[PDB]
Design a protein around this ligand. Sequence first.
Ligand SMILES: CC(=O)N[C@@H]1[C@@H](O)[C@H](O)[C@@H](CO)O[C@@H]1O
Ligand SMILES: CC(=O)N[C@@H]1[C@@H](O)[C@H](O)[C@@H](CO)O[C@@H]1O
Ligand SMILES: CC(=O)N[C@@H]1[C@@H](O)[C@H](O)[C@@H](CO)O[C@H]1O
Length: 243
Amino acid sequence: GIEKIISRSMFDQMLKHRNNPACPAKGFYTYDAFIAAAKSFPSFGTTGSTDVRKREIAAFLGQTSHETTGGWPSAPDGPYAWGYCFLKERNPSSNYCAPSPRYPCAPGKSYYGRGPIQLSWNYNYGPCGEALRVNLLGNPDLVATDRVISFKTALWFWMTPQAPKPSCHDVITGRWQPSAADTAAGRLPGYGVITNIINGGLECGKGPNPQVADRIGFFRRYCGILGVGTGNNLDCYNQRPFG
Ligand SMILES: CC(=O)N[C@@H]1[C@@H](O)[C@H](O)[C@@H](CO)O[C@@H]1O
Ligand SMILES: CC(=O)N[C@@H]1[C@@H](O)[C@H](O)[C@@H](CO)O[C@@H]1O
Ligand SMILES: CC(=O)N[C@@H]1[C@@H](O)[C@H](O)[C@@H](CO)O[C@H]1O
């Protein structure tokens, strides 16, 4: 599997501070859990040329690193060495509950960000739990409790199209071709579109944004380590958010 492209030592170099005693998630995010989880999504990091596979791994780790970052500008090893520091969304402003016939909010539960992709909203927890055969809609805390399930939610999100959004996977592997609406809106293949899929409503199409820049910094660092180009279209500053 992906262990051939990303070794334990490389993962540890990338996520240099995940086991820092200063990080709330210390000990939770393990290479073994990452590899185990990836087995359930066998085309992740095994699609296309070696160059593409490395870029996919860098893109996934880059985005998830931003979602979980403990970085600050003057941090040791730079802000892009502080991925995977957090497990739960810091200071959430709501329970992330939206109307959903299929995946209604479970009374008393909250769908704030958890795990590497900071999975949010009942309408993500619902179908993710269905795919993973666990009750994430009724027990969203599971994403912050079992390390393999945690990684699986992130990979699920990455691998799953949700129209009109393609999967992050299909974008980074070059399988996704933009529609006429996409090319008009400047949603072109690259890391920027991936940011848009993940959190574009809040981060994209509004000009320069430090969260978008942070996502790019991790991706650049990881592509450097893996020895691949990042490609272009890295930001979504001028991209209309997806529908
Ligand atoms: C641990 C934490 O609070 N992570 C959040 C994440 O939930 C949010 O989606 C992201 C947006 O850019 O930035 C934050 O760092
Ligand atoms: C954000 C980040 O770490 N960028 C680095 C850059 O500093 C370095 O010169 C290059 C080659 O090693 O790799 C990455 O682009
Ligand atoms: C990783 C994740 O859950 N991302 C969601 C995204 O699916 C949703 O479209 C958006 C709405 O603003 O909220 C983000 O938190």
